Design a protein around this ligand. Structure first.
Ligand SMILES: CCCCCCCC/C=C\CCCCCCCC(=O)O[C@H](COC(=O)CCCCCCCCCCCCCCC)COP(=O)(O)OC[C@H](O)CO
Ligand SMILES: Cc1ccc(-c2ncccn2)c(C(=O)N2C[C@H](COc3ccc(F)cn3)CC[C@H]2C)c1
Ligand SMILES: CCCCCCCCS[C@@H]1O[C@H](CO)[C@@H](O)[C@H](O)[C@H]1O
Ligand SMILES: CCCCCCCCS[C@@H]1O[C@H](CO)[C@@H](O)[C@H](O)[C@H]1O
Ligand SMILES: CCCCCCCCS[C@@H]1O[C@H](CO)[C@@H](O)[C@H](O)[C@H]1O
Ligand SMILES: CCCCCCCCS[C@@H]1O[C@H](CO)[C@@H](O)[C@H](O)[C@H]1O
Ligand SMILES: [Cl-]
Length: 305
């Protein structure tokens, strides 16, 4: 009578749920992969074609798309396999490269948003101290890459591919308990908390300032960009909060060592990994709704191809 209820429960646990879980996982990763690649390519195209769009902000936004593409093309497919098998199938060398490239992508992105807020802050709040030209934005972009490429070397250095006795795992090799705590504390503050906290205070001051016929035309244009950039910074802080918190709890507070909640821990990190990659898909979509100049070029792309 009730025996069929027990069968359908084990049918759900053994087959239906895991098959319904792998489908949503792969569809979410694939949908983000496609949208992030097309959108971020359109961003680079829209600025390359439209010469009026070659502002200092948009030159930095193109750099953000390069960091997003780097993570989507290389890191996203690797993260998808790890989140399914929970093992490393790409060998010893890629165990250092891919984790390194992901850290490099995060540094470039947050440093790019920082220089954008810094450029807007001096342009609106404190004029005539520092001149910002597209020629000098290209030099800042190169410095952003040089710094990110350098400071993420220790991340690559600690990666180790160790066999488990038939399958390999890629994880960090730490000689002592204190080093990972100090490193991952600095990682969280340097790549997340400090820049976003400064950015929030910068945009709050920019909001106070923004909210002669030429000066009114200037403000209304600057208002359209501030409204967009504040959303980008807000979506960025949200997309990156879960993984940043999970890494601090794991690496600094020694959590998630018990194997009883294993699947729930995998589910939490998996969704947080996807949220990072979803950010790359969000940015072009944000530019479409909050920027009419990007919207125009995006509509021109769908009409042509
Ligand atoms: C690693 C990479 C770093 C380098 C990357 C560079 C990134 C650069 C980005 C943006 C430029 C920001 C420019 C600076 C903007 C600063 C804006 C600012 O002063 O904020 C005020 C609030 O602060 C205050 O009370 C103080 C608030 C303190 C909050 C502390 C907790 C959050 C931490 C947040 C991060 C700390 C970082 C530390 C930097 C060394 C509000 O203004 P308001 O008009 O009301 O006048 C003040 C009023 O009189 C206070 O009532
Ligand atoms: C899957 C993924 C996605 C995003 C992040 C991330 N974390 C913090 C801020 C932003 N994003 C992480 C991550 O947890 N980290 C980044 C890095 C490893 O990245 C990868 C990426 C793909 C792969 F197959 C193996 N490792 C070094 C360790 C650690 C800090 C992992
Ligand atoms: C918003 C749409 C509805 C979401 C519903 C999610 C149901 C998940 S049931 C799932 O059953 C497994 C059986 O093996 C257990 O292991 C898991 O702990 C448990 O989470
Ligand atoms: C992304 C690829 C799919 C991942 C699915 C993970 C969820 C497993 S649910 C369930 O967990 C039980 C634990 O008690 C086992 O007994 C069952 O055999 C298993 O079905
Ligand atoms: C041993 S290799 C490397 O040596 C460092 C010493 O400088 C430690 O801090 C790291 O944890 C460890 O991975
Ligand atoms: C650069 C800053 C470095 C900060 C990290 C080093 C200090 C350890 S924090 C400490 O970690 C323990 C791990 O077991 C937890 O049990 C505690 O609750 C928590 O307070
Ligand atoms: Cl792994």
């Amino acid at each position: 009578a009730a025996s069929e209820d027990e069968f359908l429960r084990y049918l759900w646990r053994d087959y239906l749920y895991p098959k319904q879980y792998a489908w949503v996982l792969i569809a979410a990763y694939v949908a983000v992969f496609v949208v992030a690649l097309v959108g971020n390519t359109l961003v680079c195209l829209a600025v390359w074609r439209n010469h009026h769009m070659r502002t200092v902000t948009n030159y930095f936004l193109v750099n953000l798309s390069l960091a997003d593409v780097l993570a989507t093309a290389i890191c996203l497919p690797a993260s998808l396999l790890v989140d399914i098998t929970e093992s490393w199938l790409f060998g010893h060398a890629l165990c250092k490269v891919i984790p390194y490239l992901q850290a490099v992508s995060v540094s470039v992105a947050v440093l790019t948003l920082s220089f954008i807020a810094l450029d807007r802050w001096y342009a609106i709040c404190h004029p005539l101290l520092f001149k910002s030209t597209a020629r000098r934005a290209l030099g800042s972009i190169l410095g952003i890459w040089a710094v990110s490429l350098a400071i993420m070397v220790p991340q690559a250095a600690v990666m180790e591919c160790s066999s488990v006795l038939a399958f390999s795992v890629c994880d960090e090799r730490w000689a002592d308990d204190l080093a990972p705590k100090i490193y991952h504390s600095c990682f969280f503050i340097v790549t997340y908390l400090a820049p976003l906290g400064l950015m929030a205070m910068a945009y709050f001051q920019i909001f106070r300032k923004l909210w002669t016929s030429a000066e009114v035309k200037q403000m209304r244009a600057r208002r359209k960009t501030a409204k967009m950039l504040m959303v980008v910074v807000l979506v960025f802080a949200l997309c990156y909060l879960p993984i940043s918190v999970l890494n601090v709890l794991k690496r600094v507070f020694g959590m998630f060592r018990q194997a009883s909640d294993r699947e729930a821990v995998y589910a939490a990190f998996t969704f947080s990994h996807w949220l990072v990659y979803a950010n790359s898909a969000a940015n072009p979509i944000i530019y479409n709704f909050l920027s009419g100049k990007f919207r125009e070029q995006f509509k021109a792309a769908f009409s042509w191809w």
